[PDB]
Amino acid sequence: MEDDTAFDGLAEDDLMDDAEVDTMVRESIVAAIGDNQFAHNKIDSWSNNIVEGCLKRLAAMNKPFKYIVTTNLTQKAGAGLHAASCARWNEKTDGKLTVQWENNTMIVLVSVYWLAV
């Protein structure tokens, strides 16, 4: 009977591809920052541009999911960093992903969360 109980009424195609999400996040980070080194005047601009760079792609991809995008910029001055997260959600319909990017002077941590509507 249409087996809709597998994903709480969501089609199999409505589930997202983690590799695609990672590719989109990496492309957004590259487009926002580029090969430019760290800049105290452009830190805010790069974080912002990363944010809506991911968000516009997620919105235009057009599936019934509420999206959470968190961006963490770090100057690669040798400081330590430890990030952990837990949540309560419907696991069979939702998921999470995190992308870690860096260069000689840059640290980008982008966490993407999706929750079925």
Partner: protein
């Protein structure tokens, strides 16, 4: 027995009764007491940073659930790092239904570490 409940035919948490709506200042207060009970006077530990972040998120989860937001999807994030002179920037912008969903966030700072706590509550239709 695979018990299946019918749809309650209600679109908003308000029809479910009072206090069902995720309330940002209540969650902020819960977060603030969490910080002032667990994080003050603590120094950065590179070995223990991951465990502290994990425990902080886990402990936040049940006590934020204790507010009664049963039909709210909770997302809890805890980040802990070391102050040395680096420049950072933590921002987020998310796409969801603004009429039913909300958020809360706070941070604690010292010479040795920073600890930033984030929580997002999205109502489930």
């Amino acid at each position: 027995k695979e018990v299946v409940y019918e749809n309650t035919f209600i679109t908003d948490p308000e029809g479910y009764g009072p206090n069902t709506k995720f309330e940002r200042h209540k969650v902020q207060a819960v977060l603030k007491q969490v910080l002032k009970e667990r994080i003050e006077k603590q120094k950065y530990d590179p070995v223990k940073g991951a465990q502290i972040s994990k425990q902080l998120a886990d402990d936040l989860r049940e006590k934020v659930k204790a507010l009664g937001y049963d039909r709210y999807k909770l997302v809890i994030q805890v980040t802990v790092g070391q102050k040395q002179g680096q420049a950072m920037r933590i921002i987020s912008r998310c796409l969801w239904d603004q009429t039913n969903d909300n958020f809360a966030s706070e941070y604690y700072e010292n010479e040795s570490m920073y600890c930033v706590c984030q929580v997002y509550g999205l109502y489930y239709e």
